[PDB]
Amino acid sequence: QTIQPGTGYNNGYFYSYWNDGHGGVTYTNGPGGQFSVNWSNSGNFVGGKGWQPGTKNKVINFSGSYNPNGNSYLSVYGWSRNPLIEYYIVENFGTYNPSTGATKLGEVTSDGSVYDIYRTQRVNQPSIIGTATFYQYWSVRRNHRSSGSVNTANHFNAWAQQGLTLGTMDYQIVAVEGYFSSGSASITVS
């Protein structure tokens, strides 16, 4: 059930699989909300299941295993149009804290941990509307985990209070992203 890069629907859930074409990634869709990624000396990829379009008060449940060997994240990942924003709610990462070198814009408590909030910018990088310059919003969990519940309303409200405004919501998935690393992960979304 391993597939090419692309999006669509599998077992009622929206999925989005993408990579830079380097190779070494194997993304598979499972039953219901299950999806599995296995990669060894890969390029950069983003894959996972969720909802298209996402909403601003959804409660997202994820469970399974996540074992990275290198640079990788596990997060609630999505975009917003107008303004163009790429947002992460990082639950667990590998060898690199994605917020390293980013300015901290506050904290929020949700689902049993404290999240630190950051903003970064991507200049002329690819996006859901083509090459653009856009901001990234990060909610990085302190107590890492590979299963549990995410109340996005807590993060989206905390972001709004600090001056980080989301526009119209695009896709919103539980994604495994990995940049030139190895690992395996099997996540079930609900």
From Swiss-Prot:
Protein localization: Secreted
EC number: 3.2.1.8
Active site: E86 (nucleophile), E177 (proton donor)
GH11 domain location: 1-189
Enzyme class, UniProt record, top EC level: hydrolase
Entry similarity comment: Belongs to the glycosyl hydrolase 11 (cellulase G) family.
The name this protein goes by in its record: Endo-1,4-beta-xylanase 2
High-level lineage: Eukaryota, Fungi, Dikarya, Ascomycota, Pezizomycotina
